[PDB]
Amino acid sequence: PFFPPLYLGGPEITTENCEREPIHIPGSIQPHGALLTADGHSGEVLQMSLNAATFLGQEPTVLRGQTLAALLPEQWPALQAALPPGCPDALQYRATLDWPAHLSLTVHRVGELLILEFEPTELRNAMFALESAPNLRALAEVATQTVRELTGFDRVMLYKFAPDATGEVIAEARREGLHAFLGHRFPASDIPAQARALYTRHLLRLTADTRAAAVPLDPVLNPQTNAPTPLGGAVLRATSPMHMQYLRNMGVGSSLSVSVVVGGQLWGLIACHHQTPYVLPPDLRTTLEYLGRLLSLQVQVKEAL
Amino acid sequence: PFFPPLYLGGPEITTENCEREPIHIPGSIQPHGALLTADGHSGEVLQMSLNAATFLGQEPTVLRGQTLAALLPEQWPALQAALPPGCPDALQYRATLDWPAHLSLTVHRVGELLILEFEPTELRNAMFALESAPNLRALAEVATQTVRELTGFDRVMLYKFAPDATGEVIAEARREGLHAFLGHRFPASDIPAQARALYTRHLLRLTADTRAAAVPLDPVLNPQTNAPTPLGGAVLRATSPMHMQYLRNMGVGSSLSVSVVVGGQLWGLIACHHQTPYVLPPDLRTTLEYLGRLLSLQVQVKEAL
Ligand SMILES: *C/C=C1/C(=C/c2[nH]c(/C=C3[NH+]=C(/C=C4\NC(=O)C(C=C)=C4C)C(C)=C\3CCC(=O)O)c(CCC(=O)O)c2C)NC(=O)[C@H]1C
Numbered sequence A, B: 001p002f003f004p005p006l007y008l009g010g011p012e013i014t015t016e017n018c019e020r021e022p023i024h025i026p027g028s029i030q031p032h033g034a035l036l037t038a039d040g041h042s043g044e045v046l047q048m049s050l051n052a053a054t055f056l057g058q059e060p061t062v063l064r065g066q067t068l069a070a071l072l073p074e075q076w077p078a079l080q081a082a083l084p085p086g087c088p089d090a091l092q093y094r095a096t097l098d099w100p101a102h103l104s105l106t107v108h109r110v111g112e113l114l115i116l117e118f119e120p121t122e123l124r125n126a127m128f129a130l131e132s133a134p135n136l137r138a139l140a141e142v143a144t145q146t147v148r149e150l151t152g153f154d155r156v157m158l159y160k161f162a163p164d165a166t167g168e169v170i171a172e173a174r175r176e177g178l179h180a181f182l183g184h185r186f187p188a189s190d191i192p193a194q195a196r197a198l199y200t201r202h203l204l205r206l207t208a209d210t211r212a213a214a215v216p217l218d219p220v221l222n223p224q225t226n227a228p229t230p231l232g233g234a235v236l237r238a239t240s241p242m243h244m245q246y247l248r249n250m251g252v253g254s255s256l257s258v259s260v261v262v263g264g265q266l267w268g269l270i271a272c273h274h275q276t277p278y279v280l281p282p283d284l285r286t287t288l289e290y291l292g293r294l295l296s297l298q299v300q301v302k303e304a305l
């Protein structure tokens, strides 16, 4: 069972309790975007990332208590209609906002709360190539190469889970000069059980800068519930410090993975690294999510044979 | 063998490599004091903690290259005479400085380098009580109580090493309401082998604030050697982040220990905690060092019986 988060008196995580970190409720975000939460009926802004002024032009204490009707008059009606009470928490509303400089808006609903993520923003032959791979190994190779071409990441791996939850790099596409990880295996604890569970529900996550301090969300508890705000569905969620350290020690400045899900079970990850911090553009992330779903379908087919 | 320190490309320490942390050369200090290093012949200031202006009234780049003859005209001759080339690195010169507000100065020599520590500053019946204890347990109890009375620390333990380097609290004096650690045992890795080795040579160390960021020493390499500056003999040395985290998880804001050395081997520690950060005053530290040496002598006697 999860430890309380750090802002509810919980301990700092060590290797003795990797699996107890409540990674879904860090009460903080990554600094390359801003996050607000708002009441799902009134649109009242309830919580604000402390960097909100960087992206939204108003300080957290000024945004607090204003409504989405006032702040986002052109989106608020569409937002309400798209995300009614009781919809799945993976259902998203997306908009491109004009700002005096575009800003990508992504919204999802958890219970009675709307979670709004703001970040700056600017194939058919590839799909057929995945379809055309004659065996699992070839599929893995095509997938990693395709994703590397799409994203420009220094390394793209297909990381496969064994039944004991150990992991192995079974294919990779890599920049000239990087060491090989192909065939290397890793303990189950490197991607602990609560992360694997989260990754079965929320299919993409990332750390754009593995040295960047998390930006608090405040007030940290959702005022509706006096309880932590679920951020498993927010790509801007702060990453576990244990994993950030693993990445820094690996010389990785930016990391992103997409779940490969087969028969409702986490089969593996498309796992990406960059040496230098790097924000994969929002449109490239959406494409990569779609490729993950397509790869998932293809892996199910090839491994059966 | 030690990893390189973090400023020479070394990794961040994890539980897989506790013993490889080069804790003696962190290239940084605790913020409750200031540290300079100076050439042992010229007195030229070679390195400066980045907080030097807080204590010394001049910025690091202004202090750099000035001589101790200019900066400390009243102490420099005595300092030279007290710490000639080739003296033991545990030999100290101490002075009380008048400042516009006293400042404790502690100096030692390592090779051709003088290491100067600056921090703010403001029994016979007890010794006889240690002498008078009729057995090891009673000695342990008297020692912890005496140290607690001297220091005001919330907890004072006698932590004894077993031959396998596991540790046990064999006596303690504690504030009302604290849980007992008496009889609890701990793995050898909690005080890893390079720490135990350091603690056989340098008999007192502390962390005054277990949440305080370390203050860099710059330039970080000694310009004499283009190599790290040994800080094992400096009480202001930054503490291992692994240990700081252990203490925070324990609810300890301030920690200090004194080595108990029997037949040249590390027998145990007088180990002190405070819940709130706390700078044990310099004069109290000197007294506590002396009590450690006296306790060491007494333990040798009692355990033989
Ligand atoms: C005691 C806790 C530990 C720990 C926790 C942890 N790890 C993750 C997430 C990931 N770990 C990954 C591992 C690898 N990436 C690689 O490239 C390789 C080998 C080549 C390995 C073994 C990966 C891929 C992830 C997923 C996220 C990502 O793609 O960047 C989490 C969850 C992080 C989060 O979502 O907030 C946690 C809690 N990892 C350890 O090694 C120990 C120290």
Ligand SMILES: *C/C=C1/C(=C/c2[nH]c(/C=C3[NH+]=C(/C=C4\NC(=O)C(C=C)=C4C)C(C)=C\3CCC(=O)O)c(CCC(=O)O)c2C)NC(=O)[C@H]1C
Residues within 6 Å of the ligand: B014, B015, B016, B017, B018, B019, B021, B023, B167, B169, B181, B186, B189, B190, B191, B192, B195, B205, B206, B207, B238, B239, B240, B242, B243, B246, B255, B256, B257, B269, B271, B272
């Ligand atoms: C993988 C590394 C780990 C680690 C490293 C570490 N620990 C120390 C120093 C100390 N540890 C102490 C342990 C205890 N204090 C207690 O009160 C109790 C139990 C009641 C224990 C087990 C102590 C007493 C010290 C000495 C310093 C002090 O008195 O505060 C070091 C060296 C620190 C330094 O001098 O810079 C290191 C590297 N400890 C772990 O638990 C693992 C994570």
